[PDB]
Amino acid sequence: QVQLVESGGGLVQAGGSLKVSCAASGRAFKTYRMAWFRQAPGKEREFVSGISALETTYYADSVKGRFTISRDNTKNTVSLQMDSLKPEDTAVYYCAARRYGGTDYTTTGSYDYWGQGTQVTVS
Amino acid sequence: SAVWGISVYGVFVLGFYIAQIVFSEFNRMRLSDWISLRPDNWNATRVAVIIAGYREDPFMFKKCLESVRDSEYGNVARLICVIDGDEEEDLKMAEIYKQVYNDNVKKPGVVLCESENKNGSTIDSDVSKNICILQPHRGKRESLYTGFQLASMDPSVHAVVLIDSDTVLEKNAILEVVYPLSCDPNIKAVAGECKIWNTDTILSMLVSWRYFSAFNVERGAQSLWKTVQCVGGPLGAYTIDIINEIKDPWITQTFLGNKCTYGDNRRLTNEVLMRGKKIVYTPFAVGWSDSPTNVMRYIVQQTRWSKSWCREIWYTLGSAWKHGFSGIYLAFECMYQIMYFFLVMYLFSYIAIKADIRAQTATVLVSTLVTIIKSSYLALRAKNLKAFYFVLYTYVYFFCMIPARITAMFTMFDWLWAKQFLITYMWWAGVLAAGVYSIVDNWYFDWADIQYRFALVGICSYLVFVSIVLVIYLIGKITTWNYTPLQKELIEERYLH
Amino acid sequence: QVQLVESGGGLVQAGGSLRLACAASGRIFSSDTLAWFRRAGKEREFVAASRWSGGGTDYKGRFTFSRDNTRNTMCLEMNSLKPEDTAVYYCALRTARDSYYYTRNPTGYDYWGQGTQ
Ligand SMILES: CC(C)CCC[C@@H](C)[C@H]1CC[C@H]2[C@@H]3CC=C4C[C@@H](OC(=O)CCC(=O)O)CC[C@]4(C)[C@H]3CC[C@]12C
Ligand SMILES: CC(=O)N[C@@H]1[C@@H](O)[C@H](O)[C@@H](CO)O[C@H]1O
Incomplete structure (x- = not known):
């Protein structure tokens, strides 16, 4: 059982950079798979970037060369570097955690843990 | 760091193992070449067989005696049997010997290692007849010295064969272990391959295969450079001159490895090595012996062997300087x-x-x-x-x-x-x-x-x-x-x- | 422990040949010394001996020693005959328990077999 909280965001113009971090409270965070989801006001949450316990990095839809994900086990936190932001990227970001799962890592139902989410806007 | 460590371990172990295999193969090839040149019915070297045991199973002792009697060597002088004990229970082995061999059993009241006159003529008079000695129970090392003295009193012999009371010898085992002595005058001892006959236990098969692999690779590589350290029981050969020279230093050393058993097998070979004499090993001579079936007994036996090796590392390292280029x-x-x-x-x-x-x-x-x-x-x-x-x-x-x-x-x-x-x-x-x-x-x-x-x-x-x-x-x-x-x-x- | 039975024989003229076979039933340890004797009124004389493992000693150029090593059967065929070789041959065994020395003295051969000729 891990509780996810969000801290970051801001109002930056196009082409800016942001650093968003998620803090989890639990027993063993070193063995939990982390993921990031964003919900635009006009659509539903989608998988953008995620990191497993073995430091495996997954990206899709140009995130491979745009965003960077990393985790710090000592500080018990996970962060997602954001670079070259665009106006269409404006959405509230939700972090997810999972301990047991299968091949599916994109659907929202695969992850049994979620966070309150922080609002990110691009101007 | 883990990848580097595992890669280094793998490459280092593989290289050393390949070098050992190459050395063993070269030694086997040269031994085969030496054997192929000998004439048929070669019995130039006169050898004597010495058997020592204590509290040995009568069935195993009788089988060992039969295997000795089944040897095809035509230049066997005499058989020396020494029992480390002179009690009622120790007479069972003497009676077993009388069933397989002559009734010439002697029961001296003194120990040669603790007597003023250590010559074998004090307890023996005839060298043609096989003799059985029931010495007072002192230890394995004392038993071997009496056999050496009994073999040394006859100048006809030129080498001795040392086996255990539970060793089963093939018909050609004696000839193979004594043949390379005449090939090179610098050779003063030859080691024989040992096999484990009983494989009815999980541990027994594992230790049998471990012993077989050890004899193949480490002893083969050591024999390639002619610097073997494990020569003696349960199958080995020794020339008369070297044992006559080194009998006193071997018995004057202080022994604390084990009680009333575990004779100093490696110390005699180290004494030979420190004098600059080359020692080879042959795989053609095959001996059969039993292995412990209890995990605790195997553990304690290996612990005793480890303590002995840790005691004699200094001696075996100091003995390598005399060899010069070899011995490293x-x-x-x-x-x-x-x-x-x-x-x-x-x-x-x-x-x-x-x-x-x-x-x-x-x-x-x-x-x-x-x-x-x-x-x-x-x-x-x-x-x-x-x-x-x-x-x-x-x-x-x-x-x-x-x-x-x-x-x-x-x-x-x-x-x-x-x-x-x-x-x-x-x-x-x-x-x-x-x-x-x-x-x-x-x-x-x-x-x-x-x-x-x-x-x-x-x-x-x-x-x-x-x-x-x-x-x-x-x-x-x-x-x-x-x-x-x-x-x-x-x-x-x-x-x- | 061991019993020796002899086969072959009969009356043979001066010109010819015959084969003598000695049979044993048991274990001889492949180390005992095996010999043959010719005459029984004269004392037994050495003819030929050889170890089970190998080797061979004469006194010939006419008599050879052969074994089988698997059937526990032995043979000693004789090429050509002369009048004074006609006698009661004996098959004898010498044990190596007492000593490993090789002797031609018949007194050392404790075990003997009945003759045929
Ligand atoms: C409480 C339970 C659930 C845990 C049980 C642990 C063991 C069953 C496993 C864990 C890791 C394994 C080890 C990993 C590495 C090695 C080195 C290996 O040595 C060699 O490399 C020999 C080289 C050669 O000559 O081929 C011997 C086995 C061993 C100890 C393995 C033995 C079996 C081990 C101990
Ligand atoms: C009978 C015999 O040779 N035993 C030796 C033992 O004395 C030695 O301590 C050990 C070390 O490897 O090797 C064994 O083969």
Whole structure:
């Protein structure tokens, strides 16, 4: 059982950079798979970037060369570097955690843990 | 760091093993070339057989006597039998000897090692007749000295053959072990290959294959440079001059390795080596002996051997300077084994602490691969499909020899069972604690990661392999295919009477 | 422990040949010394001996020693005959338990077999 909280965001113009971090409270965070989801006001949450316990990095839809994900086990936190932001990227970001799962890592139902989410806007 | 460590371990072990195989093959080839040039019915060298034993099974002693009598060597002078005891129970072996050989049994009241006159003429008068000696119970080393004195009093002999009371000798075993003595005058001792006849126990087969592989590779490589250290029982040869020269230094040394048994086998060979005399080993001479079937007995025996080796490392390292260019291989292999033990300890500690599934899977996979390669070589050399069973020797090695080595180091570092098995129990408890800590730390499932999938597939494949090998071994037990053909004959003969 | 039975014989003229076979039933340890004797009114004389493992001693150029090593059967065929070779041949065994020395003295051969010729 891990509780996810969000801290970051801001109002930056196009082409800016942001650093968003998620803090989890639990027993063993070193063995939990982390993921990031964003919900635009006009659509539903989608998988953008995620990191497993073995430091495996997954990206899709140009995130491979745009965003960077990393985790710090000592500080018990996970962060997602954001670079070259665009106006269409404006959405509230939700972090997810999972301990047991299968091949599916994109659907929202695969992850049994979620966070309150922080609002990110691009101007 | 784990990748570098495992790569270095693999390449270093593979290189040393390949060098040992090349050395053993070269020694075998030169020995075959030497043998191919000898004439038929060669009996130029006159040898004498010496048998020493204490509290030996009468059946095994009778079988050893029969095997000695079945030798095809036509230049055997006499047989010397010495029993370390003169009590009522010690007379059973003498009666067994009388059934197989002559009734010339002597019961002297004094010990040659503790007598003013150590010559063998004091207790023996005729050299043609075989003699049996019942000396007072002092020890294994004292028994061998009496046999040496009895063999030395006859100037006709030129070499001696030393075997144990439970050794089974082939018809051509005596000829093969004594043939290379005349090939090179610098050769003063020859070692003989030993095999384990009883393979009805899980530990017995593992130790049999370990002994066979050891004799093939380490003793072969040592014989290539003619600097063997393990020469003597249960099958070996010695020239008369060297034993006459070194009998006094061998018996004047202080012995504390074991009580009333475990004669100093390696110390005599070290005494020969320190005089600059080359010693070879031959695999054609085959001897059969039993092995312990109890894990605790095997552990304590290996602990005693480890203490003896740790005592005699200094002597065996100092004996290598006389050889000149040669002899550095002894220090090289000693450093090899020391660094191998240290690397095994360091790798185990590292995998226990870091508890990384990715590195542990690769480590166990490469260890399984190299062990499978070694087993395949053993099968190819021995022409036997049962040599693949050596892959399970890693478990017994890790669970027995390492705690035995720790105990041996602790005893000589700077409650009878406390100093023997408590260390092993603590080692087992620590291994179990490390394993449970590792499994609970990485208790998760994630099929979306290829590395996790790879680790699980690897460990599952390893478990399946070990399980099917164990199943095959279990099937072989009822089928009795794993039984040695010589073992079956002994079982049937024992059943007969 | 061991019993020696002899086969072959009969009346043969001066020109010809014959084969003498000695049979044993048991274990001889492949190290005992085996010899032959010719005459029974004269004392027994050495003819030929050889170890079971190998080797061979005459006194010939006409009599050879052969064994089988698997059937526990032995043969000693004689090429050509002369009048003074006609006698009662004996098959004898010498044990190596007392000593490994090789002697031609018949007194050392404790075990003997009945003759045929
Ligand atoms: C509490 C339970 C659930 C945990 C049980 C732990 C063991 C069953 C496993 C864990 C890691 C394994 C080890 C990893 C590495 C090695 C080195 C290997 O030595 C060699 O490399 C020999 C080289 C050659 O000559 O081929 C001997 C086996 C060993 C100790 C393995 C033995 C079996 C181990 C101890
Ligand atoms: C009968 C015999 O030779 N035993 C030796 C033993 O004395 C020695 O301590 C050990 C070390 O490897 O090797 C064994 O073969």
